[PDB]
Short mmCIF file of C-alpha atoms in Angstrom, two decimals:
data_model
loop_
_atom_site.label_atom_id
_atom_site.label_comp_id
_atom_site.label_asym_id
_atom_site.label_seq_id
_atom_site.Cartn_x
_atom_site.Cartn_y
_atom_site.Cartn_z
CA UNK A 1 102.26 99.20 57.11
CA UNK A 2 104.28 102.26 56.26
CA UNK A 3 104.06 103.42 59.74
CA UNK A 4 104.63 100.48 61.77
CA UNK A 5 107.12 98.97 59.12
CA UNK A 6 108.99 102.57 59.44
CA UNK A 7 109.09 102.21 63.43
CA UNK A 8 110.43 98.56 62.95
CA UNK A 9 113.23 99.78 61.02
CA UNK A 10 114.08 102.76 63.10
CA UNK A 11 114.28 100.70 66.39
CA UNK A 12 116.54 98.54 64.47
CA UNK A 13 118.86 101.44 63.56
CA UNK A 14 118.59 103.12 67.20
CA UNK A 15 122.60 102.99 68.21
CA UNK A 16 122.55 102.78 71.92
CA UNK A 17 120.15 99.80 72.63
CA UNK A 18 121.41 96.70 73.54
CA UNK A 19 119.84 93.47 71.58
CA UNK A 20 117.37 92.32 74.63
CA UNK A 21 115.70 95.84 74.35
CA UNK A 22 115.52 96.05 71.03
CA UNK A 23 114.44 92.73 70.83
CA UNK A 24 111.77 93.86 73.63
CA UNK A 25 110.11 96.63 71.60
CA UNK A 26 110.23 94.53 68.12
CA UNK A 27 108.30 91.76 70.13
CA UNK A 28 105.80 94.92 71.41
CA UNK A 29 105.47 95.49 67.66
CA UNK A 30 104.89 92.73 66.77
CA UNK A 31 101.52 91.77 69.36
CA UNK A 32 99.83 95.41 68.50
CA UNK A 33 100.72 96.85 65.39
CA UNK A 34 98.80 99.91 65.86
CA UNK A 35 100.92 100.30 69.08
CA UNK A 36 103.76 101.69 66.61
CA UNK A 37 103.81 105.10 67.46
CA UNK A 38 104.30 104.40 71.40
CA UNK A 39 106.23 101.84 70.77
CA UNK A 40 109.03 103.80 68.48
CA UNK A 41 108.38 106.95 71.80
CA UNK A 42 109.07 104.16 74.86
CA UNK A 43 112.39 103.04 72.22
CA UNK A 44 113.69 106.62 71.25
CA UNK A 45 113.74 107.42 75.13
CA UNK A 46 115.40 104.19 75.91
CA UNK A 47 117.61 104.98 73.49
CA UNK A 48 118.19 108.50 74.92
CA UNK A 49 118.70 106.72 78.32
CA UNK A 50 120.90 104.64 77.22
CA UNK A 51 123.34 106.90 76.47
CA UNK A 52 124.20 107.99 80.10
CA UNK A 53 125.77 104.84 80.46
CA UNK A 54 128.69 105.64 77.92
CA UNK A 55 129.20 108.67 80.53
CA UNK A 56 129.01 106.57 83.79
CA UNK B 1 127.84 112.80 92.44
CA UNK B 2 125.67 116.12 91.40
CA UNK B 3 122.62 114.73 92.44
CA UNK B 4 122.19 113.23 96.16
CA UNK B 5 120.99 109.88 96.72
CA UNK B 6 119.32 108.35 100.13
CA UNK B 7 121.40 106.28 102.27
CA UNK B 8 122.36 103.08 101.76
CA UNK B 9 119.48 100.30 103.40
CA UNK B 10 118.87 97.05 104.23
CA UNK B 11 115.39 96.25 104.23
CA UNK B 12 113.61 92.05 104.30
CA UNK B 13 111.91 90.46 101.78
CA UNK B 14 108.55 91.38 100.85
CA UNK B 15 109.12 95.10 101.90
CA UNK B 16 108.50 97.81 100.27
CA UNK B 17 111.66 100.29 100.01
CA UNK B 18 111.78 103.20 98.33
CA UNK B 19 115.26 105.04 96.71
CA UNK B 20 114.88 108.76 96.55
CA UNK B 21 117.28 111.30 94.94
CA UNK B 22 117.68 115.28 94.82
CA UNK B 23 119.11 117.23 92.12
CA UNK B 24 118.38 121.28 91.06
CA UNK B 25 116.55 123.27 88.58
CA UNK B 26 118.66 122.20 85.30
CA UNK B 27 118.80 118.72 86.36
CA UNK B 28 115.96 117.10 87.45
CA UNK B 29 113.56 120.25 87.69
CA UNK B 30 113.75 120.04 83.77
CA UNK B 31 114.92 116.53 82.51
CA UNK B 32 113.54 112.96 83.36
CA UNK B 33 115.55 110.82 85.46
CA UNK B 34 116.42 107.59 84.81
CA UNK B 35 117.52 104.23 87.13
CA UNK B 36 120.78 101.76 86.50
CA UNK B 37 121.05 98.90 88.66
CA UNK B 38 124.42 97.35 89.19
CA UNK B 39 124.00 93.78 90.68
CA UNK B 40 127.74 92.95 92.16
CA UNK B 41 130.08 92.05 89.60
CA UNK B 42 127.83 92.69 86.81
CA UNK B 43 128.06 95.91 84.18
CA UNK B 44 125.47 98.35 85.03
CA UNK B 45 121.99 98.36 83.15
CA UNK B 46 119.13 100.41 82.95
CA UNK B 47 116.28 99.95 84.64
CA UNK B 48 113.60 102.16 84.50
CA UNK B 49 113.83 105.32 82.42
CA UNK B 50 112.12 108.59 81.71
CA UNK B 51 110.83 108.95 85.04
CA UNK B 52 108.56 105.80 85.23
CA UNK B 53 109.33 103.85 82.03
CA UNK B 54 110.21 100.08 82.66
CA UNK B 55 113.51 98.51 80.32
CA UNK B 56 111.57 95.33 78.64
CA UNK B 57 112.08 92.44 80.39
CA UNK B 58 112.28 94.36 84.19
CA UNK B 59 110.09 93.56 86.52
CA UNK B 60 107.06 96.17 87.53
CA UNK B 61 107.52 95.28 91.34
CA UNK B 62 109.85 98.26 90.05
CA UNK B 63 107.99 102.32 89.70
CA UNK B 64 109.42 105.15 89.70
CA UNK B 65 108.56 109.08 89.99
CA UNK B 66 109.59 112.33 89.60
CA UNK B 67 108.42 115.48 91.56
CA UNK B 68 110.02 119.05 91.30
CA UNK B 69 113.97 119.00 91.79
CA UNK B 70 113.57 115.03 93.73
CA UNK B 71 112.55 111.45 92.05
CA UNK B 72 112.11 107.93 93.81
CA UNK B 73 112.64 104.23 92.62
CA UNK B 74 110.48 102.14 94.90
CA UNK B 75 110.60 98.41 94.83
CA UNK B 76 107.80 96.67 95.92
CA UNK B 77 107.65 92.83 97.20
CA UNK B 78 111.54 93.18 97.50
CA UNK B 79 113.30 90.05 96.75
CA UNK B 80 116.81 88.53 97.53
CA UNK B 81 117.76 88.72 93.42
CA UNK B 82 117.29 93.12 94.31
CA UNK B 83 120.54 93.62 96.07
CA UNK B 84 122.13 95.79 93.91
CA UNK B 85 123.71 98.98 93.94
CA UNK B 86 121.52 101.58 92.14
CA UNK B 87 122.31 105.03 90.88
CA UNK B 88 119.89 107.85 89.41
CA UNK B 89 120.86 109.04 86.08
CA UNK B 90 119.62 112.56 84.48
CA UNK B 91 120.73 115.22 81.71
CA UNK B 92 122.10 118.62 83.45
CA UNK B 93 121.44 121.64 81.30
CA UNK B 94 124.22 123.93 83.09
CA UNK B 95 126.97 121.02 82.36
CA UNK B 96 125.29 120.16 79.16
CA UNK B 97 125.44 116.35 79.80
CA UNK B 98 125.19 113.41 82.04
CA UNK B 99 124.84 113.79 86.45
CA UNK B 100 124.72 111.29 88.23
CA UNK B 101 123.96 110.12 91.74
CA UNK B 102 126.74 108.62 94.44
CA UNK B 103 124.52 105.13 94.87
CA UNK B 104 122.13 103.69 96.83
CA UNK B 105 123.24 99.72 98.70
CA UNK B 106 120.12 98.15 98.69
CA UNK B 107 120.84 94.86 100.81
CA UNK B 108 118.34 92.63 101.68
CA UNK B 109 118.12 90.60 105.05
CA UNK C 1 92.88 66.65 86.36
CA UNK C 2 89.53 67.36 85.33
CA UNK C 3 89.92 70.51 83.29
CA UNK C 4 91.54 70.76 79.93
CA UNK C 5 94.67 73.68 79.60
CA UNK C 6 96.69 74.21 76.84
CA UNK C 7 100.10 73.25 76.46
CA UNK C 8 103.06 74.83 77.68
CA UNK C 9 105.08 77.51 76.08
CA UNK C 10 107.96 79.16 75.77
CA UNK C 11 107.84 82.90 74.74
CA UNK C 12 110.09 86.26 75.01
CA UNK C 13 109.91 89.15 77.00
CA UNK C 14 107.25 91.53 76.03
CA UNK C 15 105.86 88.51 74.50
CA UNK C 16 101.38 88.27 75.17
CA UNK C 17 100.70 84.96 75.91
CA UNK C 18 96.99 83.21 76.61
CA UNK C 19 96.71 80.12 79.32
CA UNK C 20 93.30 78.71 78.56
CA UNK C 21 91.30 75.89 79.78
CA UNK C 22 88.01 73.78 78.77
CA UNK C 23 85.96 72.31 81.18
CA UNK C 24 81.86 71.19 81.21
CA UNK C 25 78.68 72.69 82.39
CA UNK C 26 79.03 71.22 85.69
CA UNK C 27 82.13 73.60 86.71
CA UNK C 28 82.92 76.18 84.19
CA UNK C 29 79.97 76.69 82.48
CA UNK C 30 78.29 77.39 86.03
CA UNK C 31 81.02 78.33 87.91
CA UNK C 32 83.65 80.99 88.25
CA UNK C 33 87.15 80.52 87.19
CA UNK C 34 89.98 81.57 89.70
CA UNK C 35 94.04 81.22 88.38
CA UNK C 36 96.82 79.93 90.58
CA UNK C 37 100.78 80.75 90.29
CA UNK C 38 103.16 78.82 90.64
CA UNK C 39 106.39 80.22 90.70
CA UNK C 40 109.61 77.59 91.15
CA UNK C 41 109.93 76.32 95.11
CA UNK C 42 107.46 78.45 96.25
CA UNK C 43 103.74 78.44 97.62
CA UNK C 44 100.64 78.26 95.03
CA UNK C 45 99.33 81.72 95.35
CA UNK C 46 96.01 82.82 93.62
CA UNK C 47 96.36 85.61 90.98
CA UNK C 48 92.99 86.17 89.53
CA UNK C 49 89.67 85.16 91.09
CA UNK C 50 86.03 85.64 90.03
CA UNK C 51 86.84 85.38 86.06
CA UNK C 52 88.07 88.53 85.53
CA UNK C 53 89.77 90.25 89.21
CA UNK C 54 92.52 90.92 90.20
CA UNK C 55 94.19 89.43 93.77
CA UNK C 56 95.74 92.52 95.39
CA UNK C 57 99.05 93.41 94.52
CA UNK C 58 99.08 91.35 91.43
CA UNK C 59 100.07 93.24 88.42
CA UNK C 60 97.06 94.25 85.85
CA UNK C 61 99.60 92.86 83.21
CA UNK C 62 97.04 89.80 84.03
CA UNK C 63 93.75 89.72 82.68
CA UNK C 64 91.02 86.95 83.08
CA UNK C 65 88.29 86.38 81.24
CA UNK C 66 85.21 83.07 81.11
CA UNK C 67 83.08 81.98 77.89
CA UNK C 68 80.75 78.94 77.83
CA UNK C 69 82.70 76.59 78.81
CA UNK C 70 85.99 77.87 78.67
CA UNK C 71 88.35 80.60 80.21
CA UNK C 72 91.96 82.08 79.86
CA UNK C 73 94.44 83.70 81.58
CA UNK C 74 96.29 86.41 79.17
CA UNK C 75 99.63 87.92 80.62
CA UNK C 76 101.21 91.02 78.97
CA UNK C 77 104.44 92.03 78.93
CA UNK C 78 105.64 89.37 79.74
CA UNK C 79 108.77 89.02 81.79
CA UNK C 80 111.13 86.64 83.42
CA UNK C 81 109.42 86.34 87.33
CA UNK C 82 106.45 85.58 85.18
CA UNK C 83 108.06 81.92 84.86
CA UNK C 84 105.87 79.64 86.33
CA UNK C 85 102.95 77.04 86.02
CA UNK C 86 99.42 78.58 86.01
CA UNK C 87 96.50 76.63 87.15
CA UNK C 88 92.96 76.97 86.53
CA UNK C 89 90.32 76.75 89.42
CA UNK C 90 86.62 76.08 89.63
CA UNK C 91 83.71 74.70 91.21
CA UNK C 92 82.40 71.80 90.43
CA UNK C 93 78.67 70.95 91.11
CA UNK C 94 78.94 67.22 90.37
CA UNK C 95 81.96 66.56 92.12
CA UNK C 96 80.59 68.80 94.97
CA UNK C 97 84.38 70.57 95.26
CA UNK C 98 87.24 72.00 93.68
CA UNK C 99 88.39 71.10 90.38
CA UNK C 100 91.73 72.29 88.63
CA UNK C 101 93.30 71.97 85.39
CA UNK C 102 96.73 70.37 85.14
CA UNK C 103 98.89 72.89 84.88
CA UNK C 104 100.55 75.34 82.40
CA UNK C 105 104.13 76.18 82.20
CA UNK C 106 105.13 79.88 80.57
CA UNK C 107 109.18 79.47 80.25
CA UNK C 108 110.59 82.81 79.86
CA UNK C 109 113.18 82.58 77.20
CA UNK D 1 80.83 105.38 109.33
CA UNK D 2 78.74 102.12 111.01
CA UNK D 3 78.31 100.51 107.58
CA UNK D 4 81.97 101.10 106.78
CA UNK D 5 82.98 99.29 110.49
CA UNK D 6 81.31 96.97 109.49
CA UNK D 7 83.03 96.04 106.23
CA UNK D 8 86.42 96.42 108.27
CA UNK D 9 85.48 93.85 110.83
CA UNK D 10 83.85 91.42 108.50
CA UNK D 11 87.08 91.53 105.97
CA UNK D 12 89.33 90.88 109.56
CA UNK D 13 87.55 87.86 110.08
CA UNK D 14 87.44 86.14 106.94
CA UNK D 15 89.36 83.19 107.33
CA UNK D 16 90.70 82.55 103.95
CA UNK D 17 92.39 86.01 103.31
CA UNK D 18 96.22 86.14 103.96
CA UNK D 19 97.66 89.41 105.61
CA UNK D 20 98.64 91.18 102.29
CA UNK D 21 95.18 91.17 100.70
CA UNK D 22 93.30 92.03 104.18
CA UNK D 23 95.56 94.87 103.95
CA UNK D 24 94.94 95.50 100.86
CA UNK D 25 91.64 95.71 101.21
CA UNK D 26 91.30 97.35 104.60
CA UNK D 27 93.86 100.33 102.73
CA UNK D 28 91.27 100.36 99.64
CA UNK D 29 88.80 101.30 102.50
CA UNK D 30 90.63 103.59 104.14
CA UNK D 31 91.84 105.67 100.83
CA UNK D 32 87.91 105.69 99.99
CA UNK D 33 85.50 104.50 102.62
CA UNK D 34 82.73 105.21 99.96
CA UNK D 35 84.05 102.11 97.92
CA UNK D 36 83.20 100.04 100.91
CA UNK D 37 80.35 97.97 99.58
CA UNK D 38 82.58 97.16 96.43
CA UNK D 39 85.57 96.29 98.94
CA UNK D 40 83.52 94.40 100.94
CA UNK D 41 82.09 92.02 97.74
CA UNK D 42 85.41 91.44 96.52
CA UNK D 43 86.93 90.13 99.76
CA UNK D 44 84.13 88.20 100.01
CA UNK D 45 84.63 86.82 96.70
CA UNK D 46 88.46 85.94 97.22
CA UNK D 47 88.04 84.08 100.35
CA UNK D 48 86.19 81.58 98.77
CA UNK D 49 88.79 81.49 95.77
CA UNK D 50 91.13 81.34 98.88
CA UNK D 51 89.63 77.89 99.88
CA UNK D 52 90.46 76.39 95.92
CA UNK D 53 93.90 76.44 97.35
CA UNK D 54 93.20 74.54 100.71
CA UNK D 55 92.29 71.90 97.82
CA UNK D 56 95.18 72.69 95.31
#
C-alpha cells in the first residue's frame, strides 16, 4: 500500500537507528499494516532520540 | 550536567524505584525527555523516549513521565539484569542542542 | 497432558504471537481457561485467569480469549523477558480436577 | 463503607492470593471503593485459578 509501503521505506532510510530498532518497527509493520502512520511517528521520534547519543 | 538527576539508590528486587530529573523552561518545560541506560561496560542505549515511548525490544516494567520543568523513569518489579547507570536526555532551546543529566546508580541488593 | 497446545516458536521482538490449545467438552468447552508462565528457573506464576483477565501487574500486552473448545493466549510486542513456556489451565469435570496442556515455549530471538 | 469492609476482609482471607495481587486488589479498592463489587468478583475468580497451580 502506498502508505504503509512509503513508511517501510522511510524507516529503512531513518540514519540514526540502530538495526534491532529498525528491525522492531518493520516487524510492527508488518503485524498491522494500517498501524503505518504510528508506526513511521514512534520511528521518526526514535530516530530524533537517537541522535542525543552522538552528543553524549 | 544541565539537568539534575536524583541520587544514586540501591533498592531489592521486586521494588518499585522511581528516577526523577529537573531541568528549566527551554529544556524540559518545552521538549520531551528521553532515557539511556548504560549497563557496566556496555555502550549506552536508549531506553524509553519521548517522554513515555518504549525502544522495541525494552521491557514495559519500564514508564516514564514528564510534568512541567521535572520527568521520572520508574521501574517496576526491579530485577538484578536493571543495575545500570541511567541518564535523562532532552533538547535545550537556549543551547540549541543536547542536555543531559549527571546519572542515576541504580544498584540492586 | 490432556490438552492439546501448539508448538513452540521462535519469533522477534515486536513480533504478535498466539499460544493456543484444544481440549473437549468436559474441560474447555465447560470450563474457564487460566494461562501459566514460566519464565527460566523460576516459579509457575498465573498470567491470565477467567478466559480473558488479567492477573495484577501483568502487562495488557497479554490478551486471552475461549471458543468452543479451544482458547489462546496472544502476546504483543513481544520482547525478550517474554521468553518462557506458557501453559494452559482448566477444569475438568470428568477428571474431577485440574487439567493442563503441555507446554509452549516462545524463544525470543 | 460496610459493604466495601467487607470486600477488604474477604479478599485478606482468601487463601490462594499471593501478597502482590491482594495488594493489588485491596489498592484497586482503595483508588475507587465504588468498584468494590467488581474487585471483589475478580479476586474471587483468581483464587480459584490460584489453586490450578497447587496442581501444576
Amino acid at each position: 500500500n502506498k502508505d504503509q509501503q512509503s513508511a517501510f521505506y522511510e524507516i529503512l532510510n531513518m540514519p540514526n537507528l540502530n538495526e534491532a530498532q529498525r528491525n522492531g518497527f518493520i516487524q510492527s509493520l508488518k503485524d498491522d499494516p494500517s498501524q503505518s502512520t504510528n508506526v513511521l511517528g514512534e520511528a521518526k521520534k526514535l530516530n530524533k532520540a537517537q541522535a542525543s547519543l552522538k552528543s553524549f | 550536567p544541565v539537568l539534575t538527576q536524583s541520587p544514586s539508590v540501591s533498592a531489592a528486587p521486586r521494588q518499585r524505584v522511581t528516577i526523577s530529573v529537573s531541568g528549566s523552561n527551554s529544556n524540559i518545560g518545552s521538549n520531551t525527555v528521553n532515557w539511556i541506560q548504560q549497563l557496566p561496560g556496555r555502550a549506552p542505549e536508549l531506553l524509553m523516549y519521548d517522554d513515555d515511548l518504549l525502544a522495541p525490544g525494552v521491557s514495559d516494567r519500564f514508564s516514564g513521565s514528564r510534568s512541567g520543568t521535572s520527568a521520572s523513569l520508574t521501574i517496576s518489579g526491579l530485577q538484578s539484569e536493571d543495575e545500570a547507570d541511567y541518564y535523562a536526555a532532552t533538547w535545550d532551546d537556549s543551547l540549541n542542542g543536547w542536555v543531559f543529566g549527571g546519572g542515576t546508580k541504580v544498584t540492586v541488593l
